[PDB]
Amino acid sequence: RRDWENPGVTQLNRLAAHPPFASWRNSEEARTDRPSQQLRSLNGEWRFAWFPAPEAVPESWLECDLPEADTVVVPSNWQMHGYDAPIYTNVTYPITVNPPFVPTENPTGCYSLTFNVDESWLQEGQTRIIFDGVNSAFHLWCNGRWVGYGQDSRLPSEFDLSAFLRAGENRLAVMVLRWSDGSYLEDQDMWRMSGIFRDVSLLHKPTTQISDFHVATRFNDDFSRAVLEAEVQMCGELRDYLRVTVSLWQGETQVASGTAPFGGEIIDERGGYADRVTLRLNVENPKLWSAEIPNLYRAVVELHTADGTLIEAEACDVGFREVRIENGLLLLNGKPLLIRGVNRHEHHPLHGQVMDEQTMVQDILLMKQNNFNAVRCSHYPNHPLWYTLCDRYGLYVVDEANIETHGMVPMNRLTDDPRWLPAMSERVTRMVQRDRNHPSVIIWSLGNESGHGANHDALYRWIKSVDPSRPVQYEGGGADTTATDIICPMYARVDEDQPFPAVPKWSIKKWLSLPGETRPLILCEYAHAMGNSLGGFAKYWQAFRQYPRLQGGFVWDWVDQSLIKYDENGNPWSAYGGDFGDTPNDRQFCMNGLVFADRTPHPALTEAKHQQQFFQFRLSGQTIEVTSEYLFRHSDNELLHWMVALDGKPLASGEVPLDVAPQGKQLIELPELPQPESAGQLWLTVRVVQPNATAWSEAGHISAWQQWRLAENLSVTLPAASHAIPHLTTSEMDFCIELGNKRWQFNRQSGFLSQMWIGDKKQLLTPLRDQFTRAPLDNDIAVSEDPNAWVERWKAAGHYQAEAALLQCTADTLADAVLITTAHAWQHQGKTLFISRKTYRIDGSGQMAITVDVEVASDTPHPARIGLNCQLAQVAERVNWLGLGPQENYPDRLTAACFDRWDLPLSDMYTPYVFPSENGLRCGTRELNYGPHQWRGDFQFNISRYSQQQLMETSHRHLLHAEEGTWLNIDGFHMGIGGDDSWSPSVSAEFQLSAGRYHYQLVWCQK
Amino acid sequence: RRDWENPGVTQLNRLAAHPPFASWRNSEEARTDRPSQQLRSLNGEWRFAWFPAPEAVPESWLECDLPEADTVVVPSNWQMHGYDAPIYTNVTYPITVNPPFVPTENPTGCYSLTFNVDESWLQEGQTRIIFDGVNSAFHLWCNGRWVGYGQDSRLPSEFDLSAFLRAGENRLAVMVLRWSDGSYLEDQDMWRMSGIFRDVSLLHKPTTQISDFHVATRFNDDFSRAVLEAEVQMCGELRDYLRVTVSLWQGETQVASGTAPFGGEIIDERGGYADRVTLRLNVENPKLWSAEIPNLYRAVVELHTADGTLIEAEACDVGFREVRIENGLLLLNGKPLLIRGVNRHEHHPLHGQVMDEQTMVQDILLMKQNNFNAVRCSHYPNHPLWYTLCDRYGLYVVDEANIETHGMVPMNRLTDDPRWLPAMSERVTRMVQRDRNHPSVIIWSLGNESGHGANHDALYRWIKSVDPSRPVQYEGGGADTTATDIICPMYARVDEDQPFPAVPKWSIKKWLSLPGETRPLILCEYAHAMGNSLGGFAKYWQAFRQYPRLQGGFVWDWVDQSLIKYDENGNPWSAYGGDFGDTPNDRQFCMNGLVFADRTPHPALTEAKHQQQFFQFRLSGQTIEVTSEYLFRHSDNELLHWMVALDGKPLASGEVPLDVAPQGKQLIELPELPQPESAGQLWLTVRVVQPNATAWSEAGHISAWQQWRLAENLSVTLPAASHAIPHLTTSEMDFCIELGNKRWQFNRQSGFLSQMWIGDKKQLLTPLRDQFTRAPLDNDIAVSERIDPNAWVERWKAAGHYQAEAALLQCTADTLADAVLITTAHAWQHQGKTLFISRKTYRIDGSGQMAITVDVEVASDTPHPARIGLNCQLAQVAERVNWLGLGPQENYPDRLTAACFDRWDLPLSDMYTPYVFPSENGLRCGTRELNYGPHQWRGDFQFNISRYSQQQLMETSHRHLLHAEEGTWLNIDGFHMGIGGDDSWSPSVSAEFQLSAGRYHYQLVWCQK
Ligand SMILES: [Mg+2]
Ligand SMILES: [Mg+2]
Ligand SMILES: [Mg+2]
Ligand SMILES: [Mg+2]
Ligand SMILES: [Mg+2]
Ligand SMILES: [Mg+2]
Ligand code: NA
Ligand code: NA
Ligand code: NA
Ligand code: NA
Ligand code: NA
Ligand code: NA
Ligand code: NA
Ligand code: NA
């Protein structure tokens, strides 16, 4: 039958989809969500054998264990066990495009398990098997008899095994196909793996049973009263003595309860549903659910007889909340949301696509701790537990159908094709039937990157019809089609339009007001966090806050999809596309997250946390104005800490309790700030601290911060002039300067300071020279699978090959110092790119002041940076500076950083991006200390054991090796990093170094 | 595998749906729509064997002919060949409701065909087989190898046979299942049959071929300009040298033509369709298509190479027309339609569900001749030819998906179930892919009586998104759901609400104005024409004309679904439910048409033609004002004929040409109306006659008529003083009156006129007695499946109306100067209750006329009687019946608008209407004079006259079992109840036609001729 090559066959003998069941036979257990003896897990050790095609599978396997098989854990992705390679492809399908056919060589995973079933389960009732996730299609046999077939790798497939089992031992055999026609709908940008990768379980239900239940909550105008409506359906024999009781609890208190016999209201000329009933419960002053306060009730659904015998119980967590779009705004409990979201794929560096509770909880806590309030299930229904954690911890969720046909040409080839309507329809309907009772799901999504086809319109209407409680969104076909209630573009810019034909990406501000447009706009993906990125994040936040209808978005994306591999010596390392022999592949494009695969944060995570803060602040005089962005809670676990410092020197500080109602304001008046002991800039830093632990944070957590400059007292006092004067020695080869124990040597042919000595010690490994390039970032490279790419432009202009030419090198003696003047030109193929003019003035105090004036040809691409570099001979333990920090920060990604005195071990000054590049910069620095050296001015810098050259020649962080010494890059100016997208120029004009002429000054001295 | 018990499998290996193709290899043949050598029919004689279940089918059959097989004609329904019984069930499914399973005993038809294939069809290109209609599911093998499977009995299923055929002789084998999961969606109220009932053909296409084409026509604001857009898709290897030319013709004239290579515009981030192309043609002053003037153009789509070599051509007829709903009105070419529609099932009394062109033409002509302009495909896509005929003759069509799950409980159990979404979507999507280029289709329908489920909502939106050119309608779930653009109820009444819970049927006038309602309302079914019905039809038309948003409706329905059966002697008779041993069954409920199964009209048809007239008239003084309800054509084939008569006698008449623009008016003054010499009422009759024949009518066709009373001159001239005086003879048991050679006898114990003689010849077989009942009509019976105790027949029976016996109260005789007067009084009672009291006088004068005066009392608490009249069985039989009253056809109080007051003369048999299920029939109302044999009755009455007593009619279930009684039964009524018909399963006679006055008077004069 080749069911795996026919989109008209998506399953055989599969049971209806429905919300999570456990068939409790004790109501109390159901109330508290205790494990159910009737829901058994079949997870653990299974037998597995790999074959190259289904035709290669021996018939014997059906009845008996293959002695060649291995014992492996389930759930798992077979790739993770080494059976075949995982493939990383972004857009292009991993198999030839020839729907609905798949390759003849099709990796087949043959799983089996010998397990016990007690007579008790078979004497009465129904025993079904549930496979929560099988990638991509499979056939199932039990005790050698075929049972059924299934597709859609991201929803549960259930089969009735009642007629196939026997008491005692039984054997299941599952043949899993890697590719199937379902793969045409699973083209998400992620590793392509396969196997039985979600839980497998057995569930016993009685013959007369609860087969479905839907829960709804409706409110009066001010949410002071609600009606919970529970529709219950049964299967099995209708009898008048049957009853359904629905009880609602808030903690240990029962709020309401109602009971009724089956038999629904009249529906049409033929009557009503005699196998259903709707119970309605009034609830006064319900505690409402939100991501701010995830108040939950428990609904327990009992199927029982009138005499009072329980047949079975089902249940769920209920969050009383209304989601509606009104007047152009998305409202939650009548208030307009501000989505601080992130896209999150199911990825584990060791386990592949298998999810576990610990990782899920770790992700949600880091999300919450970083001011995220929402998550998009990019791009398929998640493991069931995700929803329960979101309901209980409090996150808004976008639940998305497992439909992505990005590699088709044009993109909607399948989605506009009625023959694909059935297959797509099951992806949407079964998701809704499974997840509709979760309060955390606030919006349904039709899938991702599958163009816009009629199938979409049909399905959009189906959902609107069956579940009016949530908006439906879909971005394909231009982000604003008839299949979406929300304008939900991906990578639309704040101010700049990207007018692509047919599917333009307008500036978000402009998009809201195009003629006739009235919907809210929430980006389904924005701020592509690949590598050293998130430049311009603040620009989005400023617009979201200014424009009512700009309600936020979902950053792309949470975690890097890197996988662990082992080197020849068994050490682990982070791998990406192509590292498994996979080809074609999309290399590093699989790593776009705010956190590394092990959950360590990248530096961008702090920028996101700060911009996503829930408290806004303004300063006037001595008055700090705090405004709350919360919609529902008061600041009942928050205090404000304030600190004032003079050039990093702590002056004073205080604490004030915060008592701000949602959307309210609080005025706090700072105490008299009595004169600073010396000159400099006073800085005010405020931090919102949570004194009490919560379910998602520890006592002391800081949730928000802000700084301002206060009074500045410029230094007008002079320097107690030199006890001495430096001496200059001139030679054809060099200009040497000596002062006490110091010596500086300027090479006359090169025109650079080539060596420095303190005592007998040489301070330099490589001379101090101008630098106008950087080890390109992922965004500079711009590839997702462009000669407009910054890297391309730079290379083409000769920026990385340019050679300095000496125009002038002279020495002069002043009354108290020695002054060296140089001028160099950087040229390429006759073209003068840059001209650097400098003066170095060494004085009686031993300080070397360097003044640099650079000219940039207006017609060369603006340079990545304008500074100097050198390789210091020494390797020191700490890096101390007065500037922004403590983490890495760049011009267009420095808002989260704070101006203060920071001191870190050298290593923290390096950000180990998997794909190495320029990294570790710190901006707005006025003082930098390392070893015996001190540099002063107003610059940006990075310091590490890796040169820019090495970083640009290395593909993987594990292959980096520390060089002799310490490479110092000190810049007067540095270009922003961009990141609106990672596959086109994305650095805003204001962060490009296009001024033509640049000036900067550094003071280098000892410590 | 049992694919016939799994709605997730509706086919295997079936090819995509598309509009009609013929793969012409010459463009001129495509232009002219001539036969294509690449399209072959496989209709004719095939081999067939019947089995009780698929399990009983021998494997040998795959390879070779079963000896046991018969040779039968295909297309056919196997029940019509006698292999098994057709079943007539209305709502209840014919199989136990246990979706998706079917009975294990599942009648299987094994059809096979040995035929030739030329090598030329195999050496290159693709050879596919096309089954236009297979009921209900089937597996296909070719030369013993399995090909595929298909469901949906009402759309074509195609398979590629290229790899299965060899030059020369080949054999196909088709195993057809009577029942399948598809049956759950085929519960329409009609005969349940099976087999290969529509055409089977072989189509040869080139490997590089036109695989689909869509034609759209958009207009400027005043339709003076249009753009023809043709989207073309191909299959095969793409090559830069390939081209598509689309040409538009108006007869022989090439109006426009454009050519382009393949490659559509960018659609999204991944590009456009390299395998498609859109050609855009400008058309100035296009001739527009309408049912009024079905102007058509021909679009020719050529797939060719740059050098000019034709690969193949496909084509269609194009009608430039726009359909839109605006401001609550359904507009065609910017004008609001008035739908004079009818529902039409595909039914033939000998061939079952098999359709032929002749029958189709016959239907269309009769439709057009009877002023219908639209048809609803109740309830599934029709044979493909139907659409071509409607495009060319001009009829508006509602194309309806084959989805009906009426028997479920509740009705939407499957349509609200996502698991049934796929099977349902195929029924909708494949219909649209097939029929979207036909101009006659103006509205799509999602099916019928399937409640309202989310699947509908989904499918409604799919259509709206793929084809914005036609509104979508669906009646299930209450007629005004979110899945319909049009309020389209079934059997909603004009003024009376039927407030059923959840799915009330409001009065149509009220429905339009419910809070927030704005859509147009067109009944998808109304005026149930079952038996003697269509009472109250004029009330619908008056409302449609008065309310802009009431845009008409589709009568239920065109033709009776009766089947032919043959008696002992081999004589044919019309059979209905149960007549084939089918059980359970819904008896006569399958006969609801305006015509008999053989196309002979029922009397109701004329009432429909008259109320559906396109010209309205008003009379003022000598002025006739004629208004045109046409929207597009001028009255260029019409003349007004007028005639004035005094009680049947023609005084004058004349003719005037009609020249009215659409929606215009014309005034015609009659010439000086020269007085009349005679008492009596002058009557004016006007008729609209089409002098020239047309594609759908013959010269002289009458399309409209109207009548008015003009002056009346009451007779004031006295009698004429009789020659002789009648003599009364009194005896213990009788009053006898003698005058000349005539005698009348009144029985003193009964109180009735028992005998009358002319000379020595007795004129009566049964005495003349009051009658208060009628042989119940189908509407009186009120059954659609279940008994309605509110049914009129039920009420009358319970009240004792058919059992009441006359009790004499008084019987006296008096002699007057010139006459004898008999006075009588009788009571009708039941269970000691007096139902009616009849008081009469009989006055017999010297002229021999007997004046009958009747005064009846009807108790207020008894149900209103069917009639208040007299009856008798005349001893003689006469050849003709002549009357001065309404006619010529049968007419009833609530269905007499089309009848005209005049002097009519017909053979007796025409005075009887042969309704398959017998009942009261053949009445004529408003009669002032009736002549039969030597008898003449005068007054103001309604009458019926025939060889069948009411008793017989009410005791016989089939017209073929009636026998002429001795003599002639005459029923003459002072009053007769309306017939009703708004529906036929509940009381449907409007108040105003009920005999509820309590006291009634009528008088008649019986005399000799
Ligand atoms: Mg399949
Ligand atoms: Mg226990
Ligand atoms: Mg055993
Ligand atoms: Mg993608
Ligand atoms: Mg099936
Ligand atoms: Mg029906
Ligand atoms: Na906003
Ligand atoms: Na990616
Ligand atoms: Na507080
Ligand atoms: Na690199
Ligand atoms: Na109207
Ligand atoms: Na019927
Ligand atoms: Na005329
Ligand atoms: Na009868």
From Swiss-Prot, chain B:
Listed result of changing W985 to F/G/L/T: Decreases affinity for substrate
Co-factor(s): Mg(2+); Mn(2+); Na(+)
Cofactor note as given: Binds 2 magnesium ions per monomer. Can also use manganese.
Gene Ontology biological process terms from the UniProt entry: lactose catabolic process
Site feature (Important for ensuring that an appropriate proportion of lactose is converted to allolactose) residues: W985
GO molecular function: alkali metal ion binding; beta-galactosidase activity; carbohydrate binding; identical protein binding; magnesium ion binding
InterPro entries for this protein: B-gal_small/dom_5, Bact_Beta-galactosidase, Beta-gal/glucu_dom_sf, Gal_mutarotase_sf_dom, Galactose-bd-like_sf, GH-type_carb-bd, Glyco_hydro_2, Glyco_hydro_2_AS
Mutation effect (E785 to D/Q): Small increase of the catalytic efficiency, when the sodium concentration increases
Regulation of this protein's activity per its record: Inhibited by phenylethyl thio-beta-D-galactoside (PETG), isopropyl thio-beta-D-galactoside (IPTG), L-ribose, D-galactonolactone, lactose and 2-amino-D-galactose.
Stated consequence of mutating E449H: Slowly inactivates galactosidase activity by reducing the binding of magnesium. It increases binding specificity
EC number: 3.2.1.23
Documented effect of changing D189 to E/N: Causes a significant decrease in binding affinity in the absence of monovalent cations or in the presence of potassium ions, but only a moderate decrease in the presence of sodium ions
SMART domains on file: Bgal_small_N
Induction: By allolactose.
Residues holding Mg(2+) 2: N585
Reactions catalysed: Hydrolysis of terminal non-reducing beta-D-galactose residues in beta-D-galactosides
Result, substituting E785 to A/L: The catalytic efficiency is not increased, when the sodium concentration increases
Impact reported for E525Q: 10000-fold decrease in the beta-galactosidase activity
Residues that coordinate or bind Na(+): D189, F589, N592
SUPFAM superfamilies registered for this protein in UniProt: (Trans)glycosidases, beta-Galactosidase/glucuronidase domain, Galactose mutarotase-like, Galactose-binding domain-like
Site entry: Transition state stabilizer: H345, H379
Name recorded for this polypeptide: Beta-galactosidase
Organism in which the protein naturally occurs: Escherichia coli (strain K12)
The gene coding this protein: lacZ
